[PDB]
Amino acid sequence: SLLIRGATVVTHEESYRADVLCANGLIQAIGENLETPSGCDVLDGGGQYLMPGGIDPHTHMQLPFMGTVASEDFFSGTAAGLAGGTTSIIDFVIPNPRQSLLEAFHTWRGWAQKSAADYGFHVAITWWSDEVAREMGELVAQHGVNSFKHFMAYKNAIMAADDTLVASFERCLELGAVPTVHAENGELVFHLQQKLLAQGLTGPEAHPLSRPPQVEGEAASRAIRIAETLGTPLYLVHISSREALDEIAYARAKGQPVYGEVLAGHLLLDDSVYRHPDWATAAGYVMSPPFRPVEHQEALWRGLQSGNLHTTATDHCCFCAEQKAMGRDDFSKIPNGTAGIEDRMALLWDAGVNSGRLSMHEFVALTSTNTAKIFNLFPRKGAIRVGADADLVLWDPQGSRTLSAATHHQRVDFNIFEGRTVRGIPSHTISQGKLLWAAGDLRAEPGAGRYVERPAYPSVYEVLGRRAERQRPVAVER
Amino acid sequence: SLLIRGATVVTHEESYRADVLCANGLIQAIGENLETPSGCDVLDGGGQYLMPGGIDPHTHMQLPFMGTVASEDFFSGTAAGLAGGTTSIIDFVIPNPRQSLLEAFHTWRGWAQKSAADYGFHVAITWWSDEVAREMGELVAQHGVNSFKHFMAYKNAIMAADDTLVASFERCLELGAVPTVHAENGELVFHLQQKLLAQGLTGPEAHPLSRPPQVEGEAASRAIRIAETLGTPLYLVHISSREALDEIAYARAKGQPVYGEVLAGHLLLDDSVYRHPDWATAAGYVMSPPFRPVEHQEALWRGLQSGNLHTTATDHCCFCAEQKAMGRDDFSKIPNGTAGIEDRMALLWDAGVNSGRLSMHEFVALTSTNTAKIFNLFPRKGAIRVGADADLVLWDPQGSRTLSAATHHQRVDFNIFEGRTVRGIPSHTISQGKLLWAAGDLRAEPGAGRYVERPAYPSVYEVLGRRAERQRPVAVER
Ligand SMILES: O=c1[nH]cc(F)c(=O)[nH]1
Ligand SMILES: [Zn+2]
Ligand SMILES: [Zn+2]
Ligand SMILES: [Zn+2]
Numbered sequence: 001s002l003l004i005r006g007a008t009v010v011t012h013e014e015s016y017r018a019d020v021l022c023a024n025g026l027i028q029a030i031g032e033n034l035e036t037p038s039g040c041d042v043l044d045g046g047g048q049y050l051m052p053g054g055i056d057p058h059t060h061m062q063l064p065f066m067g068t069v070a071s072e073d074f075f076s077g078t079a080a081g082l083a084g085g086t087t088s089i090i091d092f093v094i095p096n097p098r099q100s101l102l103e104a105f106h107t108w109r110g111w112a113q114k115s116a117a118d119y120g121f122h123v124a125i126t127w128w129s130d131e132v133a134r135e136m137g138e139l140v141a142q143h144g145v146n147s148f149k150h151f152m153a154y155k156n157a158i159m160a161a162d163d164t165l166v167a168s169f170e171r172c173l174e175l176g177a178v179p180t181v182h183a184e185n186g187e188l189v190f191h192l193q194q195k196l197l198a199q200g201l202t203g204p205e206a207h208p209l210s211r212p213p214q215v216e217g218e219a220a221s222r223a224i225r226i227a228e229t230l231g232t233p234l235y236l237v238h239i240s241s242r243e244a245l246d247e248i249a250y251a252r253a254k255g256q257p258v259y260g261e262v263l264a265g266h267l268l269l270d271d272s273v274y275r276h277p278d279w280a281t282a283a284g285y286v287m288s289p290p291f292r293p294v295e296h297q298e299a300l301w302r303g304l305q306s307g308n309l310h311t312t313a314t315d316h317c318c319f320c321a322e323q324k325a326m327g328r329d330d331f332s333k334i335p336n337g338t339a340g341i342e343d344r345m346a347l348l349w350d351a352g353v354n355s356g357r358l359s360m361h362e363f364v365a366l367t368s369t370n371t372a373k374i375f376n377l378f379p380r381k382g383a384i385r386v387g388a389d390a391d392l393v394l395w396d397p398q399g400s401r402t403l404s405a406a407t408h409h410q411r412v413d414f415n416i417f418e419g420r421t422v423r424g425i426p427s428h429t430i431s432q433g434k435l436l437w438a439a440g441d442l443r444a445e446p447g448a449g450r451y452v453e454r455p456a457y458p459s460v461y462e463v464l465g466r467r468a469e470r471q472r473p474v475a476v477e478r
Numbered sequence: 479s480l481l482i483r484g485a486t487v488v489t490h491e492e493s494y495r496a497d498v499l500c501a502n503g504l505i506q507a508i509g510e511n512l513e514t515p516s517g518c519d520v521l522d523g524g525g526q527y528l529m530p531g532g533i534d535p536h537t538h539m540q541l542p543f544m545g546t547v548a549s550e551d552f553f554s555g556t557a558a559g560l561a562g563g564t565t566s567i568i569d570f571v572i573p574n575p576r577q578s579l580l581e582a583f584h585t586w587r588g589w590a591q592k593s594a595a596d597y598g599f600h601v602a603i604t605w606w607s608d609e610v611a612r613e614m615g616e617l618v619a620q621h622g623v624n625s626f627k628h629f630m631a632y633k634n635a636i637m638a639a640d641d642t643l644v645a646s647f648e649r650c651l652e653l654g655a656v657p658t659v660h661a662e663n664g665e666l667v668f669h670l671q672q673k674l675l676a677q678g679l680t681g682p683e684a685h686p687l688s689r690p691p692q693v694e695g696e697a698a699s700r701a702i703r704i705a706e707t708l709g710t711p712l713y714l715v716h717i718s719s720r721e722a723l724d725e726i727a728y729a730r731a732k733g734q735p736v737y738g739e740v741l742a743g744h745l746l747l748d749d750s751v752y753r754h755p756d757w758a759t760a761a762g763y764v765m766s767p768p769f770r771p772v773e774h775q776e777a778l779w780r781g782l783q784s785g786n787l788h789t790t791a792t793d794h795c796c797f798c799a800e801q802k803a804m805g806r807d808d809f810s811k812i813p814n815g816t817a818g819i820e821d822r823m824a825l826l827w828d829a830g831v832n833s834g835r836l837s838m839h840e841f842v843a844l845t846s847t848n849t850a851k852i853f854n855l856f857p858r859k860g861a862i863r864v865g866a867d868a869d870l871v872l873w874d875p876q877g878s879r880t881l882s883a884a885t886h887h888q889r890v891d892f893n894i895f896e897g898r899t900v901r902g903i904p905s906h907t908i909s910q911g912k913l914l915w916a917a918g919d920l921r922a923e924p925g926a927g928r929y930v931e932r933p934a935y936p937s938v939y940e941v942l943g944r945r946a947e948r949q950r951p952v953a954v955e956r
């Protein structure tokens with residue numbers, strides 16, 4: 001067992017002084033001056049905040065992508081997450097077009113076995129067939145999946161057109177699963193990539209130009225309105241643009257259950273990074289959606305503060321310099337993705353809590369609880385309560401960390417926040433009730449993490465069901 | 479010649495007392511107390527308003543569509559327009575998929591020869607190839623077309639997917655042509671049509687349900703953001719929804735040249751019409767986009783008042799009861815379209831000017847001048863000035879008319895405003911300087927109308943060109 005003594009418990013709504021006892025993977029007791037069970041380890045949390053461990057619902061450990069394999073694997077990535085206070089991930093099974101979802105799922109389960117912390121999967125719908133629909137049902141019923149990812153870009157690869165989006169969202173409704181979407185208009189991206197290449201703009205600076213913000217705003221609008229028409233919730237991953245945020249807010253204001261995810265990179269970086277004179281440095285920022293003109297960062301922060309963005313994630317998708325350099329002569333061939341799993345919580349704390357943009361409670365909601373609620377893992381995760389999983393982070397508000405690819409635990413040679421110093425850091429991370437990060441000592445072990453099943457029908461589906469029953473079409477008798 | 483004496487001239491900006499002299503198809507003189515050329519006819523306009531004749535940029539005379547042919551042909555339609563104060567139309571060449579645009583154009587030119595008033599064409603892009611792109615160039619350079627229509631709905635027929643919209647909008651940019659779009663998400667419409675039919679909901683009441691307002695809002699967003707990304711203006715036909723209006727306003731607020739067209743029906747009717755107990759009556763309202771819940775009418779009115787809707791039109795697409803009954807057992811096969819060319823101006827005047835929603839100058843701007851400006855026909859049309867085409871309407875603000883299919887000149891057995899009495903009517907209509915409608919006497923003649931060419935590169939393309947210049951990508955020196 002593990003007793004965290006003397007900390008201030010900080011949840012998504014309140015703070016209070018209490019000790020927290022963990023045992024058998026679970027939170028066993030909470031209260032002032034808890035008794036210490038015999039042989040129980042005690043962690044002194046005086047002067048620190050005890051919060052739910054971060055949940056990162058958007059990682060791509062060792063993803064085969066754009067001709068290569070992410071340099072971070074499921075062990076190194078979940079270990080780096082733990083060092084950063086993140087205690088569980090939701091990654092992505094991405095079947096190739098025409099590949100069985102179940103085949104890809106089992107393969108990814110093999111890849112993820114080595115995880116050091118709890119992990120789960122969204123499954124991407126990269127093609128459509130009656131068999132895909134059948135496999136979605138088996139994944140939900142047998143394999144603990146309750147969310148299905150759709151890529152609206154990546155034309156001629158994993159892109160889902162409207163017919164697949166409609167069919168899949170309908171299937172999601174039938175299964176009580178959450179559709180999630182990468183919202184970029186793939187036709188416009190493809191068109192602009194070729195146009196820029198044809199003009200000789202082959203450098204990383206052309207990457208943002210090939211997918212300007214309205215391309216994301218458009219696709220967000222479309223996913224949102226498909227979801228509205230079919231009667232599903234919708235989770236939009238990595239929102240980077242005012243245009244997309246405004247579409248989310250516009251939907252939420254019509255009473256539609258639309259959730260927005262945001263990455264620290266898109267809150268804090270602007271598209272000037274792509275004009276760095278060093279090719280490899282500029283290419284290190286290449287991900288989709290790309291980093292945006294500065295006005296979008298303020299809009300996204302406002303989205304967090306207004307409740308129109310709901311979760312934070314990292315799109316953790318690591319490629320080293322030699323991998324990025326696959327696109328040295330063609331930006332469209334730069335494997336897209338940045339690292340972030342280790343850094344998300346401290347970046348958001350430092351930028352959001354220290355500044356007074358976000359309360360500490362909002363920080364908790366945005367780093368674990370909302371993700372848990374949306375994907376039906378609350379209060380198993382994201383909650384400090386008896387019986388919840390003992391995934392916790394002890395936070396030193398006065399601690400300091402300097403982010404650097406030379407010192408981070410992420411198995412990648414680039415950090416998009418290289419040299420940034422943050423105040424407020426995870427001093428300790430507890431996963432499954434075990435102390436896996438302790439003031440610079442990482443004790444992550446390959447294979448320790450559990451695959452986490454997520455039950456279908458999060459409670460939003462109860463409300464939608466009542467709505468649908470109220471708005472049933474009714475023929476006029478003549 | 480024809481001298482209109484003693485009226486108040488009302489333009490899109492001002493009112494003033496003056497006589498107007500027409501000769502040789504043109505406005506020859508304007509001023510108080512004009513002298514009368516010898517033998518020139520004199521029309522007494524005392525106590526009336528002399529405005530530019532209405533321009534209806536959205537008609538479908540004798541269109542072959544949904545298994546049949548509109549019951550209004552180019553003569554009966556343009557004649558009925560004259561009776562209602564509308565002096566010119568822009569209709570649509572709609573080539574079948576894989577059909578040559580030039581071939582369809584010359585066919586429509588043949589059908590339109592019988593027009594009684596000036597007429598022009600948009601050309602619809604119902605498929606794509608290098609030849610379509612080549613033919614578009616010829617239509618602009620040789621045949622006076624400067625606007626190309628795209629249907630985002632009507633899947634498996636004339637629907638254009640993103641790949642065609644991108645290629646075609648790009649071509650429009652190259653040609654200085656205005657892209658126009660019918661904005662409904664075709665996949666959602668198709669999906670819902672099949673779902674409603676599968677549920678046994680076959681009546682006209684299922685028609686609005688098969689394409690609710692967000693499917694228009696979505697398609698409007700998409701067309702708008704393709705136009706933004708490619709750098710074109712965009713004209714959205716028959717906006718019916720708050721959702722689509724809000725997308726236009728959003729785009730306009732980003733500095734994008736987006737124009738919105740609205741029909742009287744969508745300003746004044748709600749979707750309850752489709753639940754009428756009489757099947758033929760409900761079917762008479764079946765057009766796309768369909769009439770909408772009440773809140774959308776007030777939104778559209780505000781759009782006109784705020785400058786986010788720019789033109790009025792009718793989508794004049796006439797089918798009689800027996801043609802409508804082609805979908806007696808399947809609403810998806812009711813030929814879509816309503817009549818309106820004769821009624822637009824009176825409807826808008828009575829609902830907009832009498833009520834104080836719109837000034838008389840806004841009425842002129844919305845019934846002729848804005849359409850002329852957008853499609854590069856200003857000041858040849860939509861203008862009371864020396865040298866402009868003598869297309870005029872003399873308006874009796876105290877005159878009354880009751881709209882009825884039994885008495886209108888539109889060759890169709892249904893009027894969506896049956897029984898509505900309007901105050902403010904066209905007493906006289908002048909087209910090419912000739913009195914073709916006079917106090918109940920229609921004098922339209924087959925073949926009298928001229929085909930009206932529209933030059934490419936309306937001034938908006940000058941601004942866009944400077945903008946594109948300012949925004950051209952610069953490679954990073956490495
Ligand atoms: O930047 C990215 N976008 C989408 C992905 F799937 C990924 O791995 N990286
Ligand atoms: Zn993505
Ligand atoms: Zn991703
Ligand atoms: Zn239309």
Ligand SMILES: [Zn+2]
Binds near residue numbers: 793
């Ligand atoms: Zn039409």
